[PDB]
């Protein structure tokens with residue numbers, strides 16, 4: 458009861474992770490990394 462937008466309150470956590478993972482991949486190298494992207 459209370460709270461709302463449950464899928465968003467999970468999405469922010471998956472986005473912090475996926476975004477930090479994607480920023481890691483770009484920071485680390487991006488297409489130049491060679492590692493496929495976190496996807």
Ligand SMILES: *C(=O)CC[C@H](NC(=O)CCCCCCCCCCCCCCC)C(=O)O
Nearest residue numbers: 467468470471472473474475476478495496
């Ligand atoms: C949010 O989406 C977190 C998970 C996400 N992974 C993926 O998107 C890939 C698919 C993961 C499927 C996991 C299914 C687990 C089923 C239950 C297993 C119970 C037994 C386990 C025994 C060891 C991510 O980004 O990490």
